[PDB]
Design a protein around this ligand. Structure first.
Ligand SMILES: *[C@@H]1O[C@H](CO)[C@@H](O[C@@H]2O[C@H](CO)[C@@H](O[C@@H]3O[C@H](CO[C@@H]4O[C@H](CO)[C@@H](O)[C@H](O[C@@H]5O[C@H](CO)[C@@H](O)[C@H](O)[C@@H]5O)[C@@H]4O)[C@@H](O)[C@H](O[C@@H]4O[C@H](CO)[C@@H](O)[C@H](O)[C@@H]4O)[C@@H]3O)[C@H](O)[C@H]2NC(C)=O)[C@H](O)[C@H]1NC(C)=O
Ligand SMILES: *[C@@H]1O[C@H](CO)[C@@H](O[C@@H]2O[C@H](CO)[C@@H](O[C@@H]3O[C@H](CO)[C@@H](O)[C@H](O)[C@@H]3O)[C@H](O)[C@H]2NC(C)=O)[C@H](O)[C@H]1NC(C)=O
Ligand code: 9S5
Ligand code: NAG
Ligand code: NAG
Length: 461
């Protein structure tokens, strides 16, 4: 059994903003301007045979808000158990025009629709956890099945820096929906960097596929959307539908359809202002059985290089211990604290004025979010100057005939990243071994920007 997956990257119409909160009518008009565009993508996807379509986080109202300015955009989204088709019973829960339209879009096009909107939950001064505002406001994913029925509601657990317009639920919501084309899990944006609910859906609830509305700000060399989201799908052995906001001025671009084996379709564009609809086939029940011990090989072998010239380099405000790669071929080992990284490589030719380095990082990230990292990276240094290794580099000229990366990871959550010039994925030019080695299967189709083993130690957060 297979199915056709669709994702839409959306150039959103943002509200004029801000000062005084708009009226419901002004809020609704903006939301309908965005919905008219999403309607175009949903209908085409459905006409092209897609069983499900994911639309981005904040796609209907954007991201510039405080609690009071956000309020007029919010609807009380009921509990999915309530058994409701808003397209067939429009006023069951009072004034709900957005839910009604999303329900009709899914129903009239006979397709599952995943969208991100805002939930309002009025509360009284009685419960202590109730805000002085008189309500809870949540960043909410809604899922409508092919008949227009609300089948899932997910309130984002992991809020980002300055997302002050929203609340966090007391307990993480582990939201799943079952279909004739697999079991589906859902989470949003920054959730992909945490354990709850992301890891739990995969490891405990055994979902086949994740639907992921995102409004992702790209941070090279490891946290470009297409790169990290496909790495997480590969590391977690799950299908993954990433639907992102298109806003190049904020480095927002990178939607795709990912399988456990490799990427299946992807989109990156920093040049145009246009959205993009992607479609691709996937297995309904892929194999999740291909287990990897990430420290196996690396903890068995001895250092591949001795007494080398090592230097400190900054990668996304994190201080990595690096080792320059000298020669068209080599074997290097570099360590930082409990982590030892090993690389075996051979370039297609040595390109002049292009420096590559092997980096190790074992520590806590703190800038704009706290999370514990263990990273082994083969990266293209931005320039020939070693103090530029770990800086955001978008192009490279060095292809590689072979690579084999590994590390002494103190975690089972390691995401394998392969990123080519210019922010292009490499399907299926690489594989991961049961030993925890990220290695090439052919010479790379294009020049390499990075080959990384991105590990998360959730317990040390
Ligand atoms: C989400 O929805 C899914 C889909 O509906 C639910 O999964 C279904 O659960 C049913 C109940 O447990 C399963 O029914 C039993 O099936 C076996 C036959 O084995 C299957 O053969 C199928 C046809 O070839 C095949 O689709 C199926 O799935 C595959 O399983 C293999 C592993 O073997 C895996 O590799 C694949 O990826 C895929 O999952 C199996 O191979 C029957 O023997 C069994 O017996 C009957 O019991 C009935 C009573 O329940 C009775 O009517 C009858 O007389 C027999 O005694 C059941 O019919 C069904 O296989 C399974 N489908 C899939 C695709 O998983 C899932 O439970 C839902 N989850 C939640 C949380 O709600
Ligand atoms: C993944 O592979 C590694 C390597 O085999 C596994 O880690 C190893 O786990 C064993 C336990 O089975 C550890 O042994 C212990 O050694 C210490 C002394 O050093 C002591 O407490 C005991 O003598 C015990 O035998 C071993 O040290 C450890 N190695 C490392 C580097 O952590 C790992 O658990 C495997 N995981 C799976 C699920 O396959
Ligand atoms: C690389 C990664 N990118 C990232 N992380 C998180 C969010 C996120 O959750 N957003 C939610 C809505 C959003 C609020 C800010 O304005 C825009 C819309 C962005 C977006 N991009 C990252 C991680 N840690 C620090 C910095 N960046
Ligand atoms: C869906 O169809 C119903 C009638 O079939 C119609 O009233 C409604 O406007 C349609 N909605 C959309 C957004 O297609
Ligand atoms: C790297 O290691 C492999 C395996 O030991 C070896 O075949 C290869 O020649 C080495 N290359 C260099 C340049 O050290």
């Amino acid at each position: 059994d297979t199915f056709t997956a669709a994702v839409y990257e959306h150039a959103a119409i943002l509200p004029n903003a801000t000062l005084t909160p708009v009226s419901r009518e002004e809020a609704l008009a903006l939301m309908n301007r965005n919905l008219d565009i999403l309607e175009g993508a949903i209908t085409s996807a459905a006409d092209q045979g897609a069983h499900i379509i994911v639309t981005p986080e904040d796609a209907i109202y954007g991201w510039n808000f405080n609690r009071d300015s956000l309020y007029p955009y919010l609807e009380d989204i009921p509990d999915p158990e309530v058994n409701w088709i808003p397209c067939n019973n429009r006023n069951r829960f009072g004034q709900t025009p957005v839910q009604e339209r999303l329900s009709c879009l899914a129903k009239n096009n006979s397709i599952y629709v995943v969208a991100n909107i805002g939930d309002k939950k009025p509360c009284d001064t009685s419960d202590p956890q109730c805000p002085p505002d008189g309500r809870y406001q949540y960043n909410t994913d809604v899922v409508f099945d092919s008949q227009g029925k609300l089948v899932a509601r997910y309130h984002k657990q992991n809020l980002f820096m300055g997302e002050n317009q929203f609340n966090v639920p007391k307990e993480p919501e582990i939201v799943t929906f079952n279909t004739t084309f697999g079991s589906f899990g859902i989470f949003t944006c920054f959730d992909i960097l945490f354990h709850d609910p992301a890891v739990t859906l995969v490891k405990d609830f055994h979902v086949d596929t994740i639907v992921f509305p995102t409004a992702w700000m790209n941070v090279l060399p490891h946290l470009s959307a297409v790169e990290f989201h496909s790495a997480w799908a590969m590391g977690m052995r799950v299908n993954f539908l990433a639907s992102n906001i298109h806003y190049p001025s904020k480095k927002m671009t990178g939607s795709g359809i990912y399988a456990p084996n490799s990427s299946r379709a992807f989109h990156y564009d920093m040049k145009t202002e246009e959205g993009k609809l992607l479609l691709s086939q996937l297995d309904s029940h892929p194999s999740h059985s291909a287990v990897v011990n990430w420290t196996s090989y690396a903890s068995s072998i001895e250092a591949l290089s001795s007494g080398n010239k090592e230097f400190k380099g900054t990668v996304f405000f994190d201080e990595f211990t690096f080792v320059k790669l000298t020669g068209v071929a080599g074997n290097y080992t570099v360590c930082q604290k409990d982590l030892c990284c090993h690389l075996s490589y051979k370039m297609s030719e040595n390109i002049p004025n292009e420096v590559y380095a092997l980096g190790a990082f074992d520590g806590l990230h703190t800038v704009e979010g706290r999370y514990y990292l263990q990273i082994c990276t083969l990266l293209k240094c931005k320039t020939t100057n070693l103090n530029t290794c770990g800086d955001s580099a978008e192009t490279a000229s060095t292809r590689f005939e072979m690579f084999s990366l590994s590390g002494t990871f103190g975690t089972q959550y390691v995401f394998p990243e392969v990123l080519l010039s210019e922010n292009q994925l490499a399907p299926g030019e690489f594989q991961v071994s049961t030993d925890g080695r990220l290695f090439s299967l052919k010479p790379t189709s294009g020049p390499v920007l990075t080959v990384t083993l991105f590990g998360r130690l959730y317990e040390k957060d």
